[PDB]
C-alpha cells in the first residue's frame, strides 16, 4: 500500500511528487515531511497508494528510474521464547550452545553470552514454549563441561506466565 521514497532533493515539492507518481499509479495520499526547525524538506517521502498491487508495481517500475535534480530516486517497501541460563563454563562457545539447544528446539536467533557479578550467563531464544519446556526439563541443574548450569526463563517478571503460553501458542500458529 504505502511506499517509502528517498534520495529526494528538498527542492522537489509535493505537487511535483504527485504529478510524478500519478504517471505510475493513482495516489491515495502523500506524506512529505517538512522540518519545522530548518523550514525545509528532509528529502524523503511516503506515497500511500490504493493497494499493494499498485504499490508493488510502483516499487518495481519506479525504483532506479526517475532522475530528479541529478540525484536518483529510491523506492523501498515499508514475541519468542527466551531462557536465562546461569553458571556456564568458560569453555562453552556460542556455537556449542546452538548445538546443545538445537536438539530440544529450533532457535529463532543466536544465544547471547554475558557476564554478571565473573558469572557466565546466556539468553537462548526458542521458537516454541513447549520445546523451551523440554530444554528446561532436561537441562535444568545439569553438569556440562564439568560445570553445573541452571536453565530457566529470562525476565521481561519472568517469562512463562499463563497468558504467555496462550499467546506464544498463537504466535506459533
Amino acid at each position: 500500500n504505502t511506499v517509502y521514497v528517498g534520495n529526494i532533493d528538498p527542492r522537489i515539492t509535493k505537487e511535483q511528487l504527485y504529478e510524478l507518481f500519478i504517471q505510475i499509479n493513482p495516489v491515495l495520499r502523500i506524506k512529505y515531511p517538512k522540518d519545522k526547525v530548518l523550514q525545509a524538506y528532509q528529502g524523503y517521502a511516503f506515497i500511500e497508494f490504493y493497494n499493494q498491487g499498485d504499490a508493488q508495481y510502483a516499487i518495481k517500475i519506479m525504483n532506479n528510474t526517475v532522475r530528479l535534480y541529478d540525484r536518483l530516486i529510491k523506492v523501498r517497501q515499508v514475541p519468542i521464547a527466551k531462557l536465562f541460563i546461569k553458571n556456564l563454563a568458560d569453555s562453552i562457545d556460542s556455537d556449542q550452545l546452538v548445538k546443545i539447544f538445537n536438539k530440544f528446539g529450533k532457535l529463532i536467533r543466536e544465544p547471547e553470552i554475558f557476564y554478571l557479578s565473573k558469572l557466565k550467563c546466556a539468553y537462548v531464544y526458542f521458537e516454541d514454549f513447549e520445546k523451551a519446556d523440554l530444554a528446561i526439563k532436561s537441562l535444568n541443574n545439569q553438569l556440562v563441561a564439568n560445570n553445573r548450569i541452571t536453565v530457566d526463563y529470562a525476565f521481561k517478571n519472568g517469562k512463562g506466565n499463563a497468558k504467555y503460553g496462550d499467546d506464544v501458542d498463537r504466535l506459533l500458529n
Binding site: 493513482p26 491515495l28 495520499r29 490504493y50 493497494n51
Partner: protein
C-alpha cells in the same frame, strides 16, 4: 456551469378535507338587509378554513377563505352581549379572535386581537390544543396538554378588549379534555382531566376550576381521583329543578359516571353494548358528548367508538327524594364523529373525523324515559343491556352530506392528461375519481352518418316563441339540417349540395346561410317552409374563404381581393352591400366579429402569413398587427358582459391557443395570453353558462379545452369527454342549464351537460339512509402493460378478510358470470400488495398476509364477456411483514424488515433469486422505488433514503449514497436517475440529489467495481471513511436539493411528464388527511426571480401594513392583519427544516384576492412590473403549467 438547483412551485389543488374544528356562531349577514339568525357554522382544518350556512335545511358553501398558513389547533366561536365572531387559536401561541366580514365583493376574514402566547411551534407547553369559551362569552380559556392554563377575560367596547391572561401552572399534571360548564353569570367554571406526568402509578384525576371574577384568578375547587380508565368530561347545564353546584359527565371506557362538584352525587351507569361484538372488542369509550336543552327537557348525546349515539336525561326519582338520575338509551347512531353541534333549528350537524360531515333533523327524538326495557337507570349501577344496531334509521334523517376524503390511504393517477385521480372512499367504500377536467354529462346521444365537420344551432324562426330550434350539421360534400323540440328531434330547400362556411340569424325571423360558392338569404314561411329572398354570388365566381356575423351585421371574405360587408335593414328584412374595396392587401385567412350585439365594432381579420389585423367599424382602419407563429387555424371574438372586456380568442394551427385583451376605442392588441394544447389544428366555438351568467369558448383538438373567465381570472381546461368535434350551447324543456349539443370525433351526435368548473377553490369534481361499508380499503394498484387498469384491494374490520375490485374504463367489472362486481378472499388480510407480470402475456397479483405468507394470484379479463377472474397460484412463507415491494425486471423486488429479497418465478411456489443485506442503519423499509431497473431508493422508518444499484453477475444491490439527516419516509419516488422525491411521517416534502462527485464516478465506472475492485475515490472521501465511519459508510451524501413542509402526510407521489399537455413535467402528491398538490419545476430564472419577489412581498405584507398603520398613527389594525394569524410564511413553511429552493405559490395565490388598493400598495416595493403583470404571472401557473 449550469446550476442544477431545482426550483419547485408548490400548489394546493384541493385543500385539506379532515375537519378538526367547528363553531356555531352567526358571522356574516348576506343577501338580507336586516337578518339575525343563529343558524350557521364555520369549520376549520388546520390551514384550510370554510364557512357553511344552512337556513334551508340543506348545507351551503358560503366562501372558502384564504389560506391562513398555520396549524389551527383549536377554534371556538364566542357570543357576547352583536355579530358573533370566532376565537381561533393556532400555532405561534397567538390567541387570534377573528370576525368574518364582507369586504369589496367577497367575504374576507378580518382579525381583531391576537395575543402572543408561548412560542411559534406545536408544543406541550403551548397553551393550545385545548380551548373553550364561556357559553355566555364573558371569558375565553386556553390550556396546554401538560404545563399550564391561561384564561383571558373578554370584554367588548367601541373596540374589543382582551383582559390580561389569568395563569395557573401545574408542573407535572398533563391536561386532557377541557370542558367548560355553562353558568348563570355567577362565575365561569371549567373542568379538566389531569393525568400526572411523573408518578409511580397511573393516576387520572378530574379537577374542577372556578375562575373568580371577584378575585380575578382561577381557583382549584374539587380534585376527584377517578380510575385511570377515564376518557372525557361533558357539562350538565343546571339541574336547577333537581338537587352553584355543577355536575359533569365523565365518560369512562365500559361505563359512564356523572359527578357533583361537592362530591355528594356520583352516579355510575353502565354503557350498553352491541349484540354482535365482532372479533376484536374493546372496552370502547365515548368519543364525543354534547348537550341540548329545550322546554325543561335537556338531553345529551354521547357516541361510542363504534359510532353508537346515546342520550341522557335526568330524573328526580320522586319516590326516594328529588335527586338526579341518569338514563341511557339508543339512537340511529352514526359513523364516528369528532364533534357534534345543534342549531337553534332542529338540525344536528355531525362532524365526522372519519370521512364526511353530514347534517340531520331529528323527529322521533328517541325512546321515552318511561320504558324500563331498553333504557338504563342509575337505580342499579351494575347492569348490562345488549342491543342490535338499527340500520333502518328511524330517529335521525340525513339531510345533507359533504363529500370529503379525510383518510385517503393510496391513489393511482388515471388519465394523465386530465389529471384524474383514482382513490377509494374510506367508509362508503366507493370508487372516487376526482378530476381536473370539467364534469360533463352525456344524455340521449344519436349516431350521425360518417364524415362530419362543424355544427351550429339557430333558433327556429318558423315557430316564434316556441321550443323548436334548428340544428345544422355540415359534411364536406353535403349539409344536414335538423329540427329540435322537447323530446322531439326530427329531420327535414336551403343548400344540401355544398359545404356551409357559416350560418346565422339576422334581426328577427330571418336567417342567412353562407356557403363556399354562393350565399343564401332565407326567411321562414309557414311551418316547414322557408324562402330565399336573395342570393349572393361572386361577380366572376370565386370560393368564399370565410364568413363571420353579428346579430344584425355580416361579413364574408372571398378568395383574395375584397371583403364584403352586409347589414340588415331596420323596420323590415333586407340585405344591403356597400360600394367600396377593403382589399386587405393580402388573402384573408379567417374573420371574426362579436355576434352578441346587433352592432359590433372592430372586426378581427386574420392572414395566412400568420398576422392578425383589426378593422375599425372613420370606418375601416388597421390599428394593430400581430405576427404570431404558424398560420391561424380559427379565431373568435367575444366580449364578456360582466367587465365588458372584449377578448379576441385566437386559435392557431399545430395546437397553440391564444387570447387577447382588446381595447374598445383604440383596438390595440395587449395582454397576450397563450397556451399549447394537444397536437392538431384547433377549433373554437362560443357558449354561455352560469357555473351568475357566464360565457366560455370550447376548443376542439386532440383534447377538448373550455376556456372560461371567472371574476378577474380565467382558466383553460380539458373536458371529461375524450374528444368533441363541434360544440354549441343547447336548451331543452327537459331541464337544461349549461346544456350543450355537440359531436364526438367519431362523427356521432351527442347531447351533454357541463356541471362543475375548476375554480381556484375547487379545481376538481369528485366522481363517486346511512351507508357504511364494513370493508375499509387498503391499497390501490394498476397494471404496467395496460396503460390504465386500476385494481383495488380492501380489508375487513373483524375476522381477517379481503376483497379485490378491478375497474377498467368506465365502471368496474363483473366477476366471472356472477352478479357480484368484486371478489371476496376469506382469511386473507393484506399488509402490502403489488401486482406483477412475470411474462408479458400473464398477469399475477401479490398479497402479503399478516400471517407472514406471500400469496400469488392470477388476473383474467374476459374481453366481451369481460370480467375479472382471480386465481390462487402458490403459497410462500415470509420472514418479515413485507411493508414494501415493487416491480423489478421480470422479478418481484421486495423488502424484508432488514433485507431486500428479489423473488423470481418458481412453480408450486416462488423462489428467492437474490438477497441483499442492508447496511446496519436500516431497521425497516417503509417504501422504495426504482429507476429504470438499474437503480433503487430504499426508505426507512427511522433513517432516511439510501440508493442502491443492481449489479448483474454480482446478483446484488450495492448502496452508493447515504442520506444527510434522519427523515422518516412514508412514500418515495424518482424524478430522475440522480434525484429522489420523499415525504415524511411528519409532513416534510423533500427532494434530494446525488452529488456530482458521485455522478461522475457512477457514469464513468461499472457497478461491479464498487463492492470489490478498484474505484479511485478522492482523498477526502476515504478520510471521511476512517474519520466518520458511521455517517460516511455509504461514502457519499445527499446534498439537500429541495425541502418543503406540507402539514399533511403525503401518501402518493406521481411524476407526470405532462399535466394536461403542459410542457413542464410536474409531480403531484395526495396526502393522507387528503390533499393533492404539485411541484412545478420553473424553467429559466426570472420566473423564480419574479415568483420569489412576489412571495417575499406577501410574506411580510402584514408587517408592511402594520408599519404603514404605525406611521399614520405617528402623524395622527393589529400586526397579524393581513395574515390573520401570527405565523410568518418562511417560519411556518420552514418549520421542521428550512425550505431550500422551493418557492411556495399557495402564498402568491393569496395576492389575487386582495383589493386593488392593497395590491397596488404591496407592489410599490418593486421597481419591476405593475400589479396587472404580477397577477398575470401568478395566474400563469395554473393555465400554462397544467
Amino acid at each position: 456551469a449550469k446550476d442544477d438547483e431545482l426550483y419547485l412551485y408548490h400548489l394546493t389543488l384541493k385543500k385539506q378535507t379532515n375537519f378538526v374544528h367547528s363553531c356555531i356562531g352567526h358571522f356574516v349577514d348576506l343577501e338580507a338587509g336586516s337578518k339575525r339568525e343563529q343558524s350557521q357554522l364555520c369549520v376549520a382544518t388546520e390551514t384550510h378554513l370554510e364557512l357553511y350556512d344552512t337556513a334551508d335545511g340543506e348545507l351551503k358553501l358560503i366562501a372558502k377563505f384564504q389560506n391562513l398558513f398555520a396549524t389551527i389547533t383549536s377554534m371556538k366561536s364566542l357570543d357576547l352581549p352583536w355579530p358573533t365572531f370566532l376565537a381561533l387559536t393556532s400555532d405561534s401561541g397567538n390567541l387570534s379572535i377573528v370576525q368574518i366580514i364582507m369586504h369589496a365583493g367577497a367575504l374576507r376574514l378580518k382579525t381583531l386581537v391576537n395575543q402572543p402566547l408561548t412560542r411559534t411551534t406545536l408544543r406541550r407547553v403551548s397553551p393550545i390544543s385545548y380551548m373553550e369559551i364561556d357559553p355566555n362569552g364573558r371569558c375565553i380559556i386556553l390550556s396546554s396538554v401538560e404545563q399550564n392554563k391561561l384564561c383571558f377575560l373578554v370584554d367588548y367596547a367601541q373596540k374589543l378588549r382582551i383582559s390580561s391572561p389569568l395563569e395557573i401552572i401545574r408542573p407535572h399534571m398533563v391536561t386532557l379534555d377541557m370542558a367548560v360548564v355553562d353558568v348563570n353569570f355567577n362565575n365561569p367554571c371549567f373542568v379538566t382531566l389531569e393525568i400526572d406526568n411523573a408518578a409511580t402509578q397511573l393516576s387520572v384525576h378530574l379537577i374542577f376550576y372556578v375562575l373568580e371574577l371577584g378575585l380575578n384568578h382561577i381557583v382549584k375547587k374539587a380534585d376527584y381521583l377517578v380510575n385511570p380508565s377515564a376518557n372525557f368530561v361533558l357539562s350538565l347545564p343546571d339541574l336547577s329543578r333537581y338537587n352553584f353546584n355543577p355536575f359533569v359527565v365523565i365518560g369512562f371506557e365500559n361505563h359512564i359516571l356523572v359527578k357533583d362538584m361537592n362530591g355528594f352525587f356520583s352516579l355510575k351507569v353502565e354503557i350498553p353494548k352491541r349484540s354482535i361484538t365482532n372479533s376484536r372488542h374493546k372496552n370502547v369509550t365515548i368519543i364525543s358528548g354534547i348537550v341540548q336543552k329545550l322546554k325543561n327537557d335537556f338531553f345529551v348525546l354521547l357516541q361510542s367508538n363504534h359510532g353508537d349515539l346515546f342520550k341522557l336525561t335526568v330524573s328526580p326519582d320522586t319516590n326516594d327524594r328529588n335527586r338526579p338520575l341518569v338514563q341511557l338509551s339508543y339512537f340511529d347512531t352514526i359513523q364516528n364523529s369528532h364533534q357534534l353541534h345543534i342549531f337553534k333549528n332542529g338540525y344536528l350537524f355531525a362532524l365526522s373525523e372519519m370521512n364526511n360531515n353530514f347534517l340531520f333533523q331529528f323527529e322521533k327524538l328517541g325512546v321515552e324515559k318511561n320504558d324500563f326495557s331498553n333504557v338504563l337507570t342509575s337505580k342499579d349501577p351494575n347492569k348490562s343491556l345488549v342491543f342490535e344496531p338499527s340500520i333502518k334509521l328511524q330517529n335521525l334523517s340525513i339531510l345533507s352530506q359533504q363529500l370529503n376524503l379525510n383518510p385517503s390511504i393510496k391513489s393511482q393517477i388515471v388519465s394523465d392528461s386530465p389529471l384524474s385521480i383514482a382513490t377509494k372512499h374510506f367508509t362508503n367504500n366507493k370508487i372516487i375519481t376526482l378530476t381536473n377536467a370539467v364534469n360533463y354529462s352525456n344524455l340521449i346521444s344519436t349516431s350521425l352518418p360518417p364524415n362530419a365537420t362543424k355544427l351550429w344551432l339557430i333558433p327556429d324562426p318558423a315557430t316564434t316563441g316556441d321550443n323548436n330550434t334548428l340544428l345544422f350539421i355540415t359534411f364536406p360534400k353535403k349539409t344536414m339540417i335538423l329540427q329540435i323540440d322537447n323530446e322531439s328531434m326530427e329531420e327535414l330547400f336551403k343548400l344540401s349540395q355544398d359545404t356551409t362556411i357559416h350560418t346565422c340569424l339576422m334581426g328577427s325571423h330571418s336567417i342567412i346561410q353562407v356557403c363556399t360558392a354562393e350565399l343564401r338569404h332565407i326567411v321562414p314561411t309557414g311551418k316547414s317552409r322557408y324562402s330565399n329572398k336573395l342570393t349572393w354570388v361572386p361577380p366572376a365566381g370565386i370560393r368564399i374563404v370565410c364568413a363571420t356575423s353579428s346579430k344584425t351585421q355580416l361579413i364574408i371574405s372571398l378568395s383574395n381581393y375584397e371583403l364584403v360587408y352586409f347589414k340588415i335593414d331596420v323596420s323590415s328584412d333586407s340585405l344591403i352591400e356597400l360600394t367600396t374595396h377593403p382589399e386587405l392587401d393580402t388573402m384573408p385567412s379567417k374573420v371574426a366579429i362579436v355576434q352578441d350585439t346587433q352592432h359590433a365594432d372592430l372586426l378581427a381579420i386574420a392572414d395566412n402569413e400568420g398576422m392578425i389585423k383589426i378593422m375599425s367599424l372613420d370606418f375601416l382602419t388597421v390599428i394593430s398587427l400581430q405576427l404570431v407563429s404558424e398560420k391561424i387555424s380559427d379565431m373568435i371574438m367575444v366580449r364578456d358582459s360582466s367587465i365588458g372586456q372584449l377578448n379576441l380568442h385566437v386559435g392557431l394551427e399545430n395546437g397553440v391557443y391564444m387570447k387577447f385583451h382588446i381595447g374598445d376605442v383604440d383596438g390595440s392588441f395587449t395582454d397576450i395570453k397563450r397556451r399549447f394544447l394537444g397536437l392538431k389544428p384547433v377549433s373554437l366555438s362560443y357558449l354561455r353558462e352560469i357555473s351568475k351568467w357566464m360565457s366560455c369558448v370550447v376548443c376542439h383538438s386532440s383534447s377538448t379545452w373550455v376556456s372560461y373567465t371567472w371574476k378577474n381570472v380565467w382558466t383553460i381546461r380539458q373536458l371529461k369527454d375524450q374528444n368533441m368535434l363541434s360544440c354549441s350551447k343547447f336548451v331543452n324543456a327537459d331541464v337544461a342549464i349549461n346544456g350543450v349539443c355537440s359531436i364526438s370525433s367519431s362523427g356521432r351526435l351527442n347531447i351533454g351537460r357541463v356541471s362543475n368548473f375548476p375554480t381556484l377553490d375547487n379545481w376538481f369534481h369528485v366522481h363517486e339512509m346511512l351507508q357504511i361499508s364494513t370493508f375499509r380499503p387498503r391499497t390501490i394498484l394498476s397494471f404496467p402493460n395496460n396503460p390504465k387498469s386500476i385494481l383495488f384491494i380492501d380489508n375487513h374490520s373483524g375476522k381477517k378478510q379481503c376483497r379485490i375490485s378491478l375497474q377498467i374504463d368506465g365502471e368496474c367489472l363483473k366477476f366471472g358470470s356472477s352478479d357480484h362486481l368484486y371478489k371476496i378472499l376469506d382469511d386473507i388480510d393484506c399488509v402490502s400488495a403489488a401486482i406483477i407480470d412475470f411474462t408479458r402475456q400473464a398477469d399475477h397479483l401479490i398479497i402479503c398476509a399478516g400471517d407472514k405468507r406471500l400469496l400469488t394470484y392470477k388476473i383474467l379479463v374476459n374481453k366481451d364477456k369481460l370480467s375479472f377472474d382471480i386465481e390462487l397460484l402458490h403459497q410462500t412463507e415470509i420472514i418479515s411483514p413485507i411493508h414494501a415491494m415493487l416491480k423489478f425486471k421480470n422479478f418481484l423486488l421486495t423488502a424484508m424488515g432488514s433485507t431486500i429479497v428479489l423473488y423470481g418465478l418458481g412453480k408450486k411456489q416462488l423462489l428467492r433469486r437474490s438477497v441483499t443485506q442492508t447496511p446496519v442503519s436500516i431497521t425497516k423499509i417503509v417504501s422504495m422505488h426504482q429507476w429504470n431497473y438499474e437503480r433503487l431508493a430504499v426508505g426507512d422508518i427511522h433513517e432516511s433514503v439510501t440508493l442502491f444499484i443492481w449489479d448483474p453477475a454480482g446478483n446484488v444491490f450495492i448502496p452508493y449514497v447515504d442520506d444527510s439527516v434522519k427523515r422518516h419516509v412514508t412514500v418515495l419516488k424518482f424524478l430522475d436517475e440522480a434525484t429522489v422525491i420523499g415525504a415524511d411521517r411528519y409532513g416534510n416534502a423533500w427532494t434530494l440529489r446525488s452529488p456530482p462527485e458521485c455522478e461522475k464516478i457512477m457514469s464513468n465506472h461499472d457497478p461491479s467495481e464498487l463492492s470489490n475492485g478498484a474505484i479511485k475515490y478522492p482523498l477526502d472521501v476515504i478520510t471521511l471513511q476512517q474519520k466518520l465511519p458511521n455517517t460516511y459508510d455509504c461514502k457519499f451524501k445527499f446534498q439537500l436539493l429541495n425541502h418543503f413542509f406540507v402539514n399533511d402526510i403525503i401518501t402518493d407521489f406521481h411524476i407526470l411528464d405532462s399535466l394536461s399537455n403542459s410542457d413542464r413535467p410536474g409531480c403531484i402528491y395526495m396526502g393522507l388527511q387528503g390533499t393533492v398538490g404539485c411541484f412545478i419545476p420553473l424553467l429559466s430564472k426570472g420566473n423564480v426571480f419574479m415568483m420569489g419577489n412576489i412571495e417575499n412581498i406577501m410574506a411580510e405584507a402584514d408587517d408592511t401594513f402594520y408599519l404603514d398603520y404605525e406611521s399614520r398613527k405617528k402623524n395622527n389594525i393589529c400586526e397579524g392583519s393581513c395574515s390573520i394569524l401570527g405565523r410568518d410564511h418562511q417560519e411556518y413553511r420552514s418549520y421542521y427544516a428550512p425550505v431550500r429552493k422551493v418557492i411556495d405559490g399557495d402564498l402568491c395565490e393569496n395576492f389575487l384576492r386582495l383589493s386593488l388598493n392593497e395590491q397596488e400598495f404591496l407592489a410599490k416595493n418593486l421597481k419591476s412590473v405593475q400589479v396587472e403583470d404580477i397577477i398575470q404571472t401568478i395566474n400563469e401557473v395554473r393555465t400554462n403549467y397544467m
